Design a protein around this ligand. Structure first.
Ligand SMILES: CCCCCCCC/C=C/CCCCCCCC(=O)O[C@@H](COC(=O)CCCCCCCCCCCCCCC)COP(=O)([O-])OCC[N+](C)(C)C
Ligand SMILES: CCCCCCCC/C=C/CCCCCCCC(=O)O[C@@H](COC(=O)CCCCCCCCCCCCCCC)COP(=O)([O-])OCC[N+](C)(C)C
Ligand SMILES: CCCCCCCC/C=C/CCCCCCCC(=O)O[C@@H](COC(=O)CCCCCCCCCCCCCCC)COP(=O)([O-])OCC[N+](C)(C)C
Ligand SMILES: CCCCCCCC/C=C/CCCCCCCC(=O)O[C@@H](COC(=O)CCCCCCCCCCCCCCC)COP(=O)([O-])OCC[N+](C)(C)C
Ligand SMILES: CCCCCCCC/C=C/CCCCCCCC(=O)O[C@@H](COC(=O)CCCCCCCCCCCCCCC)COP(=O)([O-])OCC[N+](C)(C)C
Ligand SMILES: CCCCCCCC/C=C\CCCCCCCC(=O)O[C@@H](COC(=O)CCCCCCCCCCCCCCC)COP(=O)([O-])OCC[N+](C)(C)C
Ligand SMILES: CCCCCCCC/C=C\CCCCCCCC(=O)O[C@@H](COC(=O)CCCCCCCCCCCCCCC)COP(=O)([O-])OCC[N+](C)(C)C
Ligand SMILES: CCCCCCCC/C=C\CCCCCCCC(=O)O[C@@H](COC(=O)CCCCCCCCCCCCCCC)COP(=O)([O-])OCC[N+](C)(C)C
Ligand SMILES: CCCCCCCC/C=C\CCCCCCCC(=O)O[C@@H](COC(=O)CCCCCCCCCCCCCCC)COP(=O)([O-])OCC[N+](C)(C)C
Ligand SMILES: CCCCCCCC/C=C\CCCCCCCC(=O)O[C@@H](COC(=O)CCCCCCCCCCCCCCC)COP(=O)([O-])OCC[N+](C)(C)C
Ligand SMILES: N#Cc1ccc(COC[C@H]2O[C@@H](n3c(NCc4ccc(Cl)c(Cl)c4)nc4c(N)ncnc43)[C@H](O)[C@@H]2O)cc1
Ligand SMILES: C[C@@H]1CC[C@@]2(OC1)O[C@H]1C[C@H]3[C@@H]4CC=C5C[C@@H](OCCC(CO)CO)CC[C@]5(C)[C@H]4CC[C@]3(C)[C@H]1[C@@H]2C
Ligand SMILES: CC(C)CCC[C@@H](C)[C@H]1CC[C@H]2[C@@H]3CC=C4C[C@@H](O)CC[C@]4(C)[C@H]3CC[C@]12C
Lengths: 1105, 82, 91, 92
């Protein structure tokens, strides 16, 4: 059948015949005009009932010959005289002519259909989610008329309550009723076109206009906007989405609302609002001016079980007014003030135009309506009575329906709306259960409702109390939220492929992920021997610092808006933000590498650079208060983050703007100094004091007070615990600035000897200089090995991956390996004893030296970049050599575009040779540098250096070369100039930052380097080696200073927020917004006074007269 | 079109056909030029623009092989029938 | 244009028509060119398509690449991209 | 406190509220026992709770222990003396 609609649903229709009102009107012979006009009680014209079996009776007049017990018929049984069959009217309305052509959809079923079928196709076939509210508007359906404010404002709520809860407004469909009125609101608001309210509006197929347009299976409908003035049949209202057109099996008749609009309401209220939550979906009944039947329908919902509440409105019309009217008269519900118990019946008369026996009947309905005034409300637009019908609608389900504040809250949680609960659940004198607050936080966290996290943690829910192993452990094991589907990937990696069926994530696992994401040696609390024990055993089952544990959860499961909220709370704010920048930055890298669908990497890279920018912006807010303590923040051992440091995390995340802040540079200077006060002393004195040891005793050092913010090793702390002469040397030699200027002056004494060897002739055996040269390199190489093995990194494969990601550690490797190819072939050779440079082995080993030298002059840029002016220019020559590879290839086509024709045109007898690989590249390269070879152009000329190259075709090379240089000296070499000139600021700005970042890795390498330079370093090696076989820094604070620093961080965080809030509220754009929104409101509250004042005037013009 | 006038209903051949043949508006006086070009010089006295013509203009303006609905064998038939 | 459907397609046809009338106006002159009037009219539509695309590329980059390629069937079995290339609409 | 929060004093060294009360009518007295010891003092809005929480926004407290639970009086014995004793000191 291919269509689940008609495969399941069916259409009912009359199959027998029952003449409705047999008596013909006129046209003397009845027989034809009778049958031609006299409809069946079925519905339509009797002749129209095709359904062949009836049509073999329509042939004469009907079924059941003429009279033949004319009384007997008169029921039209809607199962026997009425069989059903598969649907042939179900499709999609297009609303022909609609101004962007708002769409909807329809089906056509039999009212005996069971609600299981309507629900399942609604959520499967029509493919929707179960709502979170059902606003079934059982109001009055007579195209009625209102005042603008209530036409306008009342929608401002009704729409808003339904878009904020994904509702399904369930009207009567028809455009001559309650449907007609919500559409007036649905358009005035427009819902900023989206998946807005998914209105259903069930109605029949009997009273419907242009039924024939939308006949056919799964068929688009040319349904047309007929505002024909009379049109007994009615159009469906415009803005309504999905429709149902239940065909009773009869034109004209009513009834195909309640048979389903009853069942649907209950049947949705039978279903669970959400996976986590376990309530019933709420039903709320709204009333626009009702009627004699509605005012009983109102009562029915009051009388249902579950007691579905109702919302009426003062000033839409007859019923909503009267139900609101008696709500004023009746007090307690049970009363009816007897002084006016038919005086309302005086009003019940005038409004409707009722009679008497129904007047008490309406009044009767009014009584049971009031008997529960509890679960029913009124909308008094004329006053300030719970404004904006939203609150009333949303609230009304909570006040009336007896449910605990838990059962209240959990609904508000499902509806992503605190403002209700903030003022209607979290109200004075409330009976808050002991664990309901806790059990709600379980739901708000998993469902990603930060706003309720805020609400609960405000009203009092300590994360310290609500954070056990089992609670936390499953927060990972949930799909009921914006889950990261990548977390399960990182886990199955660190398990080395293992992947059980369901796999309860254990906290061992999350640890091993963070150990893998944060890298290096970051040991989480989740993996330590203590925690491993207690986890295999289950307030000791709690965590000390919860918001350090949830901040990980909020970031692993990619829940940013939760992460930031959980960041501002708690403590260690700078630290947490830099961990997050590492985690996100670390997940992004794993996403790219291990792809399955959309990377979400730029989503994470944006999430890192958000946290990673708070730290920078939190630092400057601390550097501007007390620059000293703000340098202690970057260095204190954290103790909740694996004994790491607020700066070693930034360096781990390659977060250049932090290490390149002016606090991470004034500290690094303060360590570069050491115990020296080099603002008083001068670099002249250090260079002297090195080559003059006893001049160390005239250098002005720093007190232990001036080295509080400066992390130290254990030994320097001891020399400041346990200045004397002996401690006045140790503080010099173990200074980074001294270890530098004590290596430079060695290296600059290495390059002056090596240079001497390279230039001066070299006999069989190395001269005294060349032995010293080998000594440096050898001992220097050892310094480069021990620099690797004793590196911070863990697995050797990672130690052998950071030290080779450095331009100068490769260039050392190439230069230390190469010099020992050189010393090998220089010392290891036969030495002809007649002339050197007749042993190509000897020759070779030298030319290794004379070329390796370039590695060693170029290294002075590692020394020259120490300066704040020279560093950048050194860090630009990388970014200019890189970003011009493509111009320079274009400059090599042109070179061979010219070199091949010229060597072909000028030397036309050349056998194959390697000279044909130089001479097509040689002179055309030296032309770029202004050497024109002017007496070799026009080789046939009289002034030629090449008078033998004159031959056929050699008059062409002056032209080719003219064309050549115009390209290689005017177009292309001045394209470079324009390249550099326009890429200068944006590389100079960076190269400062790449420099200020690399200053970290440089200083903190001398702060672990031997005192003694690479000719004599071998002593300090043997000392450390000999003793390590026989026998980094820390910011040592006292327990009192740990508090003072802790106080510093707290205040500095609090200001960061308090300043930005004012920088936003003080800005003009924001004051225009408020001013605008006030001045809107002002216009309203003035003009209403302007009205009212105009009533107090026309009053007093007539009261006394 | 808001109060309800379906363009699907108000768009016949005769209606549409004369909307080109009007001077009662901000007319482009160039349309008559492109037409007399694609006719290869021909230019009758009054020249009721036919929808064959507008097609051959669009085939000429859009270039390449853009065939309009107005020139296909089907539409040519029905236009010579109404 | 805003009414109806196939909005991206229509705008790129317009950019071609106006761009094509402008060229014929310049060539075959009789009085004031009205060409810069048309060239402004093309680059208005022709800029809606660009600004309609980015609004679709930022939602689901996949489907927004299917928009550029589905046979149109109301515009001579052409394509929302083969029309841009026809109008030399570089952006 | 309702005022102290509505204003927030743009977090600073703002008002340094004292709010002297006893240790007798106080809630969760046992949480904050011990010498110079951080206290896990908790926000108990238990609906009945004859014992009462200290209000939130109040800074420095004094919890004069008369030597009796339940009893009152450990406001006036000092909140008298303090007032006079500060009024005895020079403003600057
Ligand atoms: C931190 C990581 C980066 C640094 C890496 C550090 C490691 C560096 C890596 C080095 C690897 C490079 C290769 C080894 C060098 C020799 C190669 C060679 O050609 O030898 C030659 C000499 O061979 C001899 O035996 C005579 C000279 C003594 C050898 C001294 C070289 C080894 C020193 C290494 C000290 C390194 C340890 C430094 C301290 C740690 C063999 O040829 P020949 O005999 O001359 O030929 C005679 C031909 N004829 C007879 C025809 C004339
Ligand atoms: C007597 C003399 C004889 C020799 C004369 C001839 C000398 C010839 C001259 C040679 C030029 C030498 C200088 C170039 C140094 C490399 C630059 C660099 O570090 O790039 C990048 C290294 O990127 C990486 O991925 C790291 C591993 C790459 C190693 C490159 C080896 C080049 C060897 C060449 C062999 C030449 C041997 C030739 C001789 C046999 C920069 O870092 P990164 O990209 O960020 O690193 C990855 C880090 N990340 C993954 C965290 C992002
Ligand atoms: C026919 C002749 C043709 C020309 C010949 C060749 C000449 C040219 C040289 C060729 C040498 C080969 C290395 C090229 C550099 C690659 C890397 C780069 O571009 O920049 C990278 C680093 O860059 C560096 O670390 C080094 C930059 C090159 C310096 C060149 C030496 C200058 C002095 C020589 C004096 C010699 C004088 C004596 C000569 C006897 C940086 O790039 P980035 O954009 O920041 O990318 C991010 C980096 N990241 C991954 C680490 C995060
Ligand atoms: C990664 C970036 C790539 C970098 C660029 C590409 C790499 C560079 C590639 C260069 C091409 C290769 C050249 C060498 C070929 C062998 C030469 C030979 O054997 O003999 C030659 C000797 O002369 C020499 O050997 C001199 C060295 C070559 C000149 C290099 C020019 C560099 C400038 C241009 C560089 C710009 C390149 C522009 C791009 C095309 C000539 O033959 P012969 O007969 O032996 O000599 C006469 C001796 N006799 C008189 C005594 C008889
Ligand atoms: C611009 C203002 C300045 C003046 C303008 C005046 C224009 C008037 C020009 C007139 C040119 C014709 C007269 C010369 C021929 C006479 C014979 C002769 O000497 O033949 C010589 C060939 O030399 C040539 O063929 C010369 C080059 C001819 C082409 C000129 C350029 C085209 C115009 C520009 C367009 C360029 C396109 C630009 C592209 C961007 C041979 O003699 P040889 O050299 O001794 O070699 C023989 C030796 N052997 C026999 C031993 C082997
Ligand atoms: C702050 C500045 C940097 C600090 C300095 C860096 C620290 C380390 C500094 C220098 C290392 C010193 C080593 C020298 C040992 C040998 C000395 C010598 O001359 O021997 C030799 C003695 O004889 P000769 O007079 O040379 O005559 C030739 C002898 N021959 C015949 C045996 C060939
Ligand atoms: C590895 C790092 C070690 C640390 C370095 C220090 C240790 C190195 C220490 C001593 C090394 C030398 C001792 C051995 C004997 C030397 C003999 C000699 O060469 O004499 C020559 C001088 O010397 C030179 O010309 C070369 C050495 C000095 C200049 C180059 C290094 C200076 C920098 C390093 C120091 C300052 C640093 C400045 C920058 C901060 C003189 O003789 P000549 O030139 O042949 O001519 C004589 C005339 N005649 C030939 C006609 C008779
Ligand atoms: C040799 C093994 C090669 C294998 C690779 C080893 C790599 C380097 C390893 C280790 C580091 C360096 C030490 C070894 C190399 C230098 C010493 C040397 O070899 O002297 C030679 C003697 O030469 C002299 O007596 C005159 C000149 C050198 C003496 C001054 C040494 C300078 C280094 C001191 C300052 C730095 C140390 C500071 C720490 C306190 C002995 O060697 P030889 O070959 O027998 O000499 C030729 C024959 N002859 C003896 C007749 C003259
Ligand atoms: C660990 C890495 C190791 C690297 C490779 C180790 C290579 C070790 C290689 C060789 C060791 C043994 C030496 C002898 C070789 C055989 C030839 C021979 O004996 O003599 C011939 C020498 O012919 C030559 O070509 C000599 C030079 C070649 C070496 C080039 C190495 C390049 C290194 C690149 C830089 C690497 C940088 C790495 C950067 C990361 C001829 O001479 P003869 O017959 O002896 O007598 C004179 C002849 N006559 C009579 C004609 C005048
Ligand atoms: C043995 C007897 C004694 C004499 C020997 C020793 C002579 C002197 C040695 C070298 C010459 C330069 C000396 C200037 C140093 C000034 C001080 C200074 O500020 O240094 C700076 C650079 O520090 C460096 O070390 C820069 C690199 C110099 C050593 C490497 C050689 C490069 C120059 C040769 C290249 C070949 C060129 C060839 C030219 C022919 C560091 O400090 P800063 O940048 O001011 O820091 C700013 C912020 N702060 C101040 C707040 C901290
Ligand atoms: N204080 C301080 C300080 C001391 C030394 C240095 C020198 O730089 C050392 C490191 O600087 C690295 N580096 C460099 N080095 C620049 C450079 C190195 C060598 C030469 Cl010959 C030249 Cl033409 C330029 N450029 C980098 C870049 N663009 N991005 C990331 N890293 C870069 C390089 O790996 C090199 O090992 C920088 C700062
Ligand atoms: C994209 C670019 C197009 C241009 C180009 O790069 C790529 O294409 C390359 C092809 C090269 C030639 C290939 C083979 C040989 C044979 C050899 O024969 C030795 C014989 C004898 C010596 O006496 C042995 O004993 C001599 C050299 C020669 C001609 C090459 C020259 C360079 C050429 C032309 C290169 C040129 C730069
Ligand atoms: C082709 C071979 C056989 C001949 C020699 C090739 C030339 C081009 C080689 C020999 C030595 C080389 C230099 C050796 C060391 C360095 C330092 C490095 O930081 C940049 C590259 C640089 C500057 C090299 C550039 C290329 C170089 C000059």
């Amino acid at each position: 059948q291919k269509s689940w609609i008609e495969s399941t649903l069916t259409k009912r229709e009359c199959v027998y015949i029952i003449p409705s009102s047999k008596d013909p009107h006129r046209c003397l012979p009845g027989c034809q005009i009778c049958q031609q006009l006299v409809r069946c009680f079925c519905g339509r014209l009797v002749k129209q009932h095709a359904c062949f079996t009836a049509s073999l009776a329509m042939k004469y007049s009907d079924v059941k010959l003429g009279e033949h017990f004319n009384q007997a018929i008169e029921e039209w049984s809607v199962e026997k005289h009425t069989e059903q069959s598969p649907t042939d009217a179900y499709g999609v309305i297009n609303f022909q002519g609609g101004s962007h052509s708002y769409r909807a959809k329809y089906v056509r079923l039999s009212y005996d259909t069971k609600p299981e079928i309507i629900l399942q196709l609604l959520l499967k076939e029509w493919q929707m989610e179960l709502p979170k509210l059902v606003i079934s508007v059982h109001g009055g359906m007579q195209k009625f008329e209102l005042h603008p404010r209530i036409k306008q404002l009342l929608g401002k709520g009704l729409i808003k309550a339904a878009v904020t809860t994904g509702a399904w407004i369930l009207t009567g469909g028809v455009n001559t009723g309650v449907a007609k009125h919500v559409g007036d609101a649905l358009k005035e608001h427009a819902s900023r076109s989206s998946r807005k309210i998914c209105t259903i509006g069930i109605a029949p197929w009997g009273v419907i206009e242009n039924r024939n347009d939308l006949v056919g299976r799964d068929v688009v409908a040319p349904y047309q906007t007929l505002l024909n003035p009379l049109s007994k049949l009615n159009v469906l209202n415009n803005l309504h989405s999905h429709f149902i057109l239940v065909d009773d099996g009869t034109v004209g008749k009513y009834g195909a609302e309640v048979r389903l609009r009853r069942e649907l309401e209950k049947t949705i209220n039978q279903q669970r609002i959400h996976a986590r939550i376990g309530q019933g979906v709420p039903v709320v009944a709204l009333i626009f001016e009702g009627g004699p039947n509605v005012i009983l329908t109102v009562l029915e919902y009051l009388q249902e079980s579950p007691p579905v509440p109702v919302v009426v409105c003062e000033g839409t019309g007859r019923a909503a007014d009267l139900l609101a009217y008696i709500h004023k008269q009746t007090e307690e519900g049970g009363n009816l003030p007897d002084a006016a118990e038919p005086d309302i019946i005086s009003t019940i008369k005038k409004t409707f135009n009722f009679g008497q026996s129904e007047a008490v009947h309406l009044f009767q309905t009014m009584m049971e309506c009031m008997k529960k005034k509890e679960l029913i409300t009124v909308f008094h637009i004329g006053s300030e009575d719970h404004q904006d019908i939203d609150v009333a609608i949303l609230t009304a389900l909570l006040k009336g329906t007896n449910a605990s504040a838990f059962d209240q809250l959990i609904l508000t949680l499902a509806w992503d709306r605190v403002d209700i609960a903030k003022n209607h659940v979290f109200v004075y004198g409330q009976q808050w259960l002991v664990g309901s607050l806790e059990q709600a936080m379980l739901d708000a966290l998993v469902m990603d409702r930060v706003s309720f996290v805020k609400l609960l943690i405000e009203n009092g829910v300590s994360m310290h109390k609500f954070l056990t192993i089992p609670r936390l452990e499953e927060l990972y094991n949930t799909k009921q939220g914006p889950t990261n589907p990548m977390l399960f990937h990182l886990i199955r990696d660190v398990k080395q492929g293992n992947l059980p069926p369901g796999y309860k994530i254990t906290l061992i696992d999350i640890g091993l992920v963070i150990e893998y994401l944060m890298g290096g040696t970051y040991r989480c609390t989740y993996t330590r021997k203590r925690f491993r024990l207690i986890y295999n055993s289950l307030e000791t089952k709690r965590f000390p610092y919860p918001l350090n544990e949830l901040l990980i959860w909020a970031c692993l499961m990619k829940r940013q808006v939760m992460a930031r909220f959980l960041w501002q709370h708690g403590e260690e704010s700078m630290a947490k933000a830099l961990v997050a920048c590492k985690i996100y930055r670390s997940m992004a890298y794993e996403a790219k590498q291990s792809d399955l669908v959309d990377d979400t990497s730029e989503e994470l890279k944006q999430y890192s650079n958000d946290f990673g920018q708070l730290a920078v912006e939190l630092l400057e807010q601390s550097f501007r208060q007390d620059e000293t303590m703000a340098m202690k923040l970057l260095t204190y051992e954290l103790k909740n983050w694996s004994n790491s440091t607020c700066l070693k995390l930034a360096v781990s995340s390659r977060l250049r703007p932090f290490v390149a802040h002016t606090c991470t540079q004034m500290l690094l200077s303060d360590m570069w100094m050491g115990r020296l006060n080099m603002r008083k002393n001068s670099w002249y004195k250090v260079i002297l004091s090195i080559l003059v040891p006893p001049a160390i005793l005239m250098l002005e050092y720093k007190t232990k007070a001036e080295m509080s913010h400066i992390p130290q090793s254990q030994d320097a702390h001891q020399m400041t615990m346990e200045l004397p002469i002996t401690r006045k040397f140790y503080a010099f030699y173990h200074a980074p600035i001294v270890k530098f200027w004590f290596n430079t002056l060695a290296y600059l004494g290495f390059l002056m000897l090596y240079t001497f060897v390279v230039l001066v002739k070299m006999e069989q055996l190395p001269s005294v200089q060349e032995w010293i040269v080998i000594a440096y390199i050898f001992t220097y190489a050892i310094e480069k090995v021990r620099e690797v093995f004793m590196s911070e990194a863990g697995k050797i494969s990672q130690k052998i991956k950071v030290w080779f990601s450095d331009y100068f550690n490769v260039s050392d490797t190439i230069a230390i390996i190469s010099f020992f190819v050189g010393f090998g072939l220089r010392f290891g050779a036969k030495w002809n004893y007649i002339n050197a440079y007749d042993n190509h082995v000897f020759v070779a080993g030298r030319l290794i030296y004379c070329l390796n030298i370039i590695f060693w002059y170029v290294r002075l840029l590692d020394f020259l970049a120490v300066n704040q002016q020279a560093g950048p220019y050194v860090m630009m020559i990388g970014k200019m050599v890189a970003n011009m590879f493509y111009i320079v290839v274009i400059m090599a086509l042109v070179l061979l575009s010219f070199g091949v024709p010229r060597k072909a045109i000028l030397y036309p007898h050349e056998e194959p040779s390697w000279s044909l690989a130089k001479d097509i590249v040689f002179h055309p390269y030296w032309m770029i540098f202004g050497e024109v070879y002017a007496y070799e152009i026009d080789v046939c000329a009289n002034d030629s250096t090449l008078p033998t190259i004159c031959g056929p075709g050699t008059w062409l090379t002056p032209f080719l070369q003219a064309v050549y240089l115009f390209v290689q000296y005017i177009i292309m070499v001045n394209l470079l100039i324009a390249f550099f000139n326009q890429v200068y600021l944006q590389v100079k700005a960076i190269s400062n930052i790449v420099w200020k970042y690399q200053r970290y890795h440089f200083i903190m390498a001398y702060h672990e380097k031997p005192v003694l330079p690479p000719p004599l370093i071998i002593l300090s090696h043997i000392v450390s080696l000999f003793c390590c076989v026989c026998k980094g820094p820390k910011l040592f604070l006292t327990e009192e200073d740990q508090k003072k620093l802790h106080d510093f961080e707290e205040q500095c965080v609090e200001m960061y927020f308090d300043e930005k809030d004012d920088k936003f509220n003080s800005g003009s754009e924001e004051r225009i917004r408020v001013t605008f929104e006030r001045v809107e409101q002002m216009s309203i509250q003035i003009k209403e006074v302007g009205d009212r004042v105009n009533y107090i005037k026309r009053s007093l013009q007539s009261l006394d007269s």
